[PDB]
Amino acid sequence: EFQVLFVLTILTLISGTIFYSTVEGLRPIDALYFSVVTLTTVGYGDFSPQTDFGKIFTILYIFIGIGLVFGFIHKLAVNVQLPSILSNLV
Amino acid sequence: EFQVLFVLTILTLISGTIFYSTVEGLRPIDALYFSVVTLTTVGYGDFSPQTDFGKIFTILYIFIGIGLVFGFIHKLAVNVQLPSILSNLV
Amino acid sequence: EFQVLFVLTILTLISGTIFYSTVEGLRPIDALYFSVVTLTTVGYGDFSPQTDFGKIFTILYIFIGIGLVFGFIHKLAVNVQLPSILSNLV
Amino acid sequence: EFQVLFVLTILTLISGTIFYSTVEGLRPIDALYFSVVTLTTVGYGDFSPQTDFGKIFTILYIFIGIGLVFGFIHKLAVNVQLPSILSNLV
Ligand SMILES: [K+]
Ligand SMILES: [K+]
Ligand SMILES: [K+]
Ligand SMILES: [K+]
After folding, report:
1. Do residues B23 and B61 lie in contact, with contact meaning Cβ atoms separated by under 8 Å?
2. Is D68 on the interface with A (CB under 8 A)?
3. In 3-state terms, what secondary structure has residue C23?
4. Would you call A11 an interface residue with chain B, using a CB distance cutoff of 8 Å?
5. What is the DSSP string of chain D?
6. CB A31, CB A19: distance < 8 Å
7. Size of interface A-B (CB pairs under 8 A)
8. Nearest-5° Cα angle at C33, D62 to B60
9. Are A55 and A31 a contacting pair, CB within 8 Å?
10. Nearest CA among A24, A64, A63, A69 for reference residue A47
11. Computed from CA positions of residues A21, B31, B79, B42, in that sequence, does the dihedral angle turn out positive or negative?
């Protein structure tokens, strides 16, 4: 469960990294950071797409990616972080 | 279920596209992108309303639109993406 | 239920409007718009607090306000928007 | 329950305060404010990391912190705010 969502999240972030590095000219690290900041809905806006291709991709990436990323966050919190916290209390 | 939320999401995004293109002077593609970035709560701020009409509309659009857009995202994730993922594992 | 959350949301937004208009010098309409953009987690950043008082208030306002605003949005979506949609289908 | 999430949220925010004050050169109050604005997903972008260290930390901080912060917000809303509201109605 967690492993599948972890792998899917990595793949989704790799896709954004490649897209934004190529089409929007970002350094790969900036493209990865931007992809994370986007799909977690933080949205600083220090980076944002300038091209119409980038804007269209971003629309679709948000709709397809938010569900996966927040599914991963939920499983991380409930199946990894929560048991680790409980274990520390004993 | 999914079809109804899909159609409602398209209609909601068309409404924002028309509003922001007219009142805020955005290109239609920018107005659509801004509407998506708003209702998914990303909020880059590369675009934001400059007129009081735009600010008032945005308040109401957020309150009326977030529930529909995140209902659609939830149904997309659970009723489309999840079964597709499970099918790939077999 | 819905009425109580509606009133609480209005009161919470009035509080932010008064605070940001006074301490951060915003026009009341801008303060209301900023309060909404904050508590719905959109966060354009076209407005943001410049004073330390404003930053401290914003921290506490977010933590106390997000739960109320998203409780209201949930009740709006499920108890008002959903039945209205279903009624249109018949 | 609430106490544990409260303490964990404080610890998580202290960690961000120390990190962003040191690596990104922010005043401690700005680092705390930025940490809150990040983990609640508001993301104004008035502050954002400029260094690659800061961007990498921010990616990991978001993934590890969102679950804790929104767990705390949920418990605050349902176990503290809700009973206080109900008590006011009698
Ligand atoms: K945001
Ligand atoms: K958000
Ligand atoms: K934002
Ligand atoms: K922003």
Report:
1. no
2. yes
3. helix
4. no
5. -HHHHHHHHHHHHHHHHHHHHHHS---HHHHHHHHHHHHTT----SS---SHHHHHHHHHHHHHHHHHHHHHHHHHIIIIIHHHHHHHT-
6. yes
7. 57
8. 95
9. no
10. A24
11. positive
A66 contacts on B by Cβ (under 8 Å): 40, 73, 77
Provide the residue ranges of all domains of chain A, joining segments of one domain with +: 1-90
Q: Which residues contact C41 (CB under 8 A, 6 or more apart)?
A: A41, B41, B43, C66, D40, D41, D42, D43
Classify burial at A80, counting beta carbons within 10 Å of its beta carbon; exposed 0-12, middle 13-18, buried 19 or more: middle
Buried b / exposed e along C29-64 (16+ C-beta atoms within 10 A) = ebbbbbbbbbbbbbbbbbbbbeeeebbebbbebbbb
Please tell me if residue B41 touches chain C, with a CB cutoff of 8 Å: yes
Helix residue ranges, H only, chain A: 2-23, 28-39, 52-76, 82-88
Q: Supply the DSSP string of C39-62, one letter for each residue.
A: HTT----SS---SHHHHHHHHHHH
In terms of Cα–Cα distance, which of C89, A67, D44, A8 is closest to B48? D44
AA letter at A35: S
Determination technique for this entry:
X-ray
The helix or strand, by DSSP H or E, that contains position B60, with its residue range, turns out to be helix B52-76
The answer to whether residues D28 and D17 touch, using CB atoms and an 8 Å cutoff, is yes
Question: Which residue in chain A has the smallest CA separation from B71?
Answer: A67
Q: How far apart are CA C19 and CA C26, in angstroms?
A: 9
Q: Which residues contact A23 (CB under 8 A, 6 or more apart)?
A: A49, A51, A53, A54, A57
Round the CA-based radius of gyration of chain A to a whole number and report it: 15
- Taking phi first (over 0 means left), then psi (-120 to 50 degrees means alpha), and beta for anything else, what does residue D21 get? alpha
Using CA atoms, how far apart are residues D73 and A59, in angstroms rounded to an integer?
28
CA of A51 vs chain D CAs: smallest distance (Å): 21
Resolution in A: 1.2
